[PDB]
Design a binder for this molecule. Structure first.
Ligand code: FES
Length: 132
């Protein structure tokens, strides 16, 4: 019975828990990552003001945050498109752009999440008749 059984459809199986770090423009604070939780969900408990708190709302332009050099490297790198896109920015690293949905795993051990961008707040809007 030569079989592989390597791949599985049970991603819910989260490994041991780890600890992460929340770095902001003001300072960096410690964060605890528990199996079954999420980074964005952690920042809420620790108090870190992580950009998000949205569940498919309309207030969403683009998601781009800075992540650990190595953590992001192994986590995955951008493609040609994202390469030139970010390459156009001033001293912009591919680790500055990412999605908006991650889980807590062993690979997140000592993971550093740098949030250079600011959080959403009271701000007028409507001055966009013909946005290029
Ligand atoms: S969750 Fe709203 S832009 Fe990322």
């Amino acid at each position: 019975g030569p079989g592989s059984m390597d791949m599985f459809s049970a991603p819910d199986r989260i490994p041991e828990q780890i600890r992460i770090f929340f770095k902001t423009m003001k300072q960096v604070v410690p964060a605890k990552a528990v199996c079954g939780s999420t980074v964005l969900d952690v920042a809420h408990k620790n108090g870190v003001d992580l950009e998000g708190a949205c569940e498919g709302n309309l207030a969403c332009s683009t998601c781009h945050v800075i992540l650990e050099e190595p953590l992001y490297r192994k986590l995955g790198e951008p493609s040609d498109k994202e390469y030139d896109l970010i390459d156009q920015a001033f001293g912009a690293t591919g680790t500055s752009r990412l999605g908006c949905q991650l889980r807590v795993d062993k690979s997140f051990e000592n993971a550093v999440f740098t949030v250079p961008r600011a959080t959403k707040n009271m701000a007028v809007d409507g001055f966009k008749p013909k946005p290029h």
